[PDB]
Subunit: 588 residues, 2 copies
Amino acid sequence: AAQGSAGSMLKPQQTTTRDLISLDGLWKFALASTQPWTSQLKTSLECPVPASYNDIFADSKIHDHVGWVYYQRDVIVPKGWSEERYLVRCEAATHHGRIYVNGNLVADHVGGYTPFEADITDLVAAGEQFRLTIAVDNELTYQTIPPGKVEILEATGKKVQTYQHDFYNYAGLARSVWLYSVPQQHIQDITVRTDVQGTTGLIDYNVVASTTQGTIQVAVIDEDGTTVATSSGSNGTIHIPSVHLWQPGAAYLYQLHASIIDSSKKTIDTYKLATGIRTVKVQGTQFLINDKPFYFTGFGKHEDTNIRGKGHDDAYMVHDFQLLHWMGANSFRTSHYPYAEEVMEYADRQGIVVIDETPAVGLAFSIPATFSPDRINNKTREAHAQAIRELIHRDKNHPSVVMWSIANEPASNEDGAREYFAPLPKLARQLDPTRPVTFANVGLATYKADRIADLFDVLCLNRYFGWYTQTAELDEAEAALEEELRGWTEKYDKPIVMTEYGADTVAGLHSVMVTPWSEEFQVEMLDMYHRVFDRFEAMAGEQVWNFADFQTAVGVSRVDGNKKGVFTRDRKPKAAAHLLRKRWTNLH
Amino acid sequence: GSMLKPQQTTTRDLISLDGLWKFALASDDNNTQPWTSQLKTSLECPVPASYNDIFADSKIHDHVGWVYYQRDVIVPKGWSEERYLVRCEAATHHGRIYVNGNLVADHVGGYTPFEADITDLVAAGEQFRLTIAVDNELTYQTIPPGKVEILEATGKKVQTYQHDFYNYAGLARSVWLYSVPQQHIQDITVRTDVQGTTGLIDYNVVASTTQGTIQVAVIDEDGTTVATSSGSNGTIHIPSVHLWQPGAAYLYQLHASIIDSSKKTIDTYKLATGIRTVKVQGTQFLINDKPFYFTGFGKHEDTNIRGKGHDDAYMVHDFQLLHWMGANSFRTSHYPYAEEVMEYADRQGIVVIDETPAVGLAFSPATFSPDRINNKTREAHAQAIRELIHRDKNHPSVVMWSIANEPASNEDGAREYFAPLPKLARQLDPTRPVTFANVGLATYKADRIADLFDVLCLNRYFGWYTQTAELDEAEAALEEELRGWTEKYDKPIVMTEYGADTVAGLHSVMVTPWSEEFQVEMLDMYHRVFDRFEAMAGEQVWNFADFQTAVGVSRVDGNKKGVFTRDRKPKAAAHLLRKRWTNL
């Protein structure tokens, strides 16, 4: 883990040449008390892996814990492995993960939403058994990339985790853990850039191999199963005659088979990696996927379900996606962190557009000046960029991912904000020149007051007039909102997307009168917002906040988390769901 | 400018005017004087109610300013030779009575009576058009204070105010036409003392003219008269009296009649009294010379459609729910409630803290100045004390006056403002201790009003605001404050309010606010701490039931701190309370 760079490999898969093993299951679990990774574990406490631990146990001490926790289990390297290089991966640690093989530290990793792994091949032998213990610290600071500070309670002395975001600070191994193998000479990375000449579809590729052994073949197969182009070399471009384009309601995916042939006509490594072929351009006030203009519809979302909290779930993913299709949503935004990788591949097959967001949420203090040597400084920017790299490295390939979101609701109206943010969108366009760049702008940072927006390609606005400013005054709110829309459309020649608009709603709370927290009120606000968007020709999309009720930090104005959900936390449609379905399916 | 609650006797008659009145709100027509014509509305608004929620119409509910209630009234033929008048039990804040286009009263209290002798305005046996104008506007000088403002873009009028509950306007309490004899009784006063086993009472009647003589009978609950007296006032002993006790209501009836030259009764009034004494000595609240502990709630006049409007059934049920859960008391939160509730409490043996309508004397800008709350405001504040005490002085159930809720008792000006007020109270009624409900910020250090009051009423919400979801931490900050007060003042302390919001049906096994469980845990841990402080005089949970409030992003369709739901269903805390309050 180095400054200015990203060292993950490709998403482990199984092949004729590589082997894959799941470490998911229950693991022994305990709380920081000393040096637990040097002996076995002493607990009847077992925690499921793909999951956040906080809610799992029905224990207050555990849920409330500030610091490190310890997952542990034994592992056996299959005896079939020697002559194969093998290693241990975490798709994500809560925030700060550490990997111990038997009681030597083998990896330390600061991102909370991106993979990390350790090559253990010289460290254990094929056929041998070791003690995998993984340490996850949930502590946020001013330098950690969702920012925060631990404090202490004057009377009881209890440790307490402050932060500036909405959603609860769920910790642990939220994403699958793996033990896999790769041949000594292997493909480590692949870069795919899809473009279109007339009707001919060309993808520039780039394959990275552990050594300089043999050569690099690439077959490119269609959905039916018949290869449609081939190539040699670590890099080039591939021509596809009469391409089936990946379309935002009509996913087409070709399968790029990268192989590492040895001296002779023999395959020694291979890797299957799906791409779809699509361009993304912003021209002025317009968002083009495949040179036709596009309008987002959908939600910012969360990784949040009932007991597992943030832990990725196969069936909620599929269900969630069906609800999107049910209502004719075409996109969503990975809200305030990168989601599980498997959600991105699913999004690709599913033909859903994604706004991929770094875990930079709450870069402000006004939910004290936020950009200084105290709160958000240069060491913080360093971590912010560190996170931009790992996200892009990981996600660069998904045709569904369509624009990077640098941050949520940063204090972009304050002195200091511009210096801070300047290198970040520039980093993004550099590492990946194919997609546009944005961040979701807060209400305070008005068109006048914001000093960041010009550095970005698309304008993403979060607004809540009918909620905060004009509380229940929908007409006075329609005033405020078009005031603001005008301001942006006049000052800038970018396209605009409402990334956040909504109102807390308690399922079953009804009222014939104007009343916030009533299914009815939610409808009305949503509806008048829509009416306003349609009168602005500069709008390029709309994302309700949020998909579904979700858990947040304890708070008096938070009714057991955030209820701005259009669906309940158990995924049941409020009235708003049906409004959105009616608008999204019945017009363009 | 009031008089005893109208009642039917052998010499007084009494008509209810409740029912559907033609209702219309003031627009800016040519018709600037609507009270001198038929109303253009085809809306009928029920009277005992209050209008906002009634019509399912926003413009009505949202309205800032005047509305008009109107109906025809027939003064009975037999009323002549008799003196009759039109009373309003209450309005919204500002009420004006018009009798055939004629302005006949204008009254600025929001929750007390006003009336008009109309004997010379309408002929007995004749019909007249009665129209009542009620204005809902608060100002820096109305007793709940607040300002009206204009929404910049749309232009819509809006009413700001400082207090929790919604600003329901209208004729929230009954309207009457009633008869009284030319030479009638106007006011009575009763003061009950206990002298060993014997109960004594000092009656003071004020009739219209001074001819004939005043006579008084005192009848027990069984029909048998038990002491007699003569004279516009004197003092009565009652051998082995039956005491009105907080567990066991007992109400003697006092018949005060106005005898004439002969042996005939020209006028007469039935007035229930219970015999009972209230003394605060040291940290102790003694009812009939034994230590007492308030259990119960702050309540609200708030039900579903009628809003603030008095309701017989919800009244009876509410009390039945106090009995169900072993409550013994309550506080007329942030306004005197309807007269009949106080009467009912008497019959019910329920103890009452009578509060004025003075909330939201607090702007957290400097709140006590020639801008926000000045002398003029303080005039109106003293007026409400006058009218509250004048109306309610007699009730054995009323046991303390509460001058105001949650004023900024910690800011400059606070002291000069309040000084005269409790003095006023004790002057108007020596028989009861005086208080106000202390806000959180006004700590035992910061507060500069408290020494001037008999009992200390506080309403701490740490586990809610301060140590939000940190009950162990809140426990400490709580006992810290209680040491402070009990260390600093030699008076009884009553948690006037306390508790957390809760959504019925919302559940959790861990520490999560807005779950039924969290409420039980907060309420509980407070009781643990109350039981450790010997200075404590009572606990009143903050709230009997959920009630509507001013619209807010932090208020889920009102306040949900209620121990029951708005339709009066038990939350988890109701049962916790019932368990504690019945059993020890």
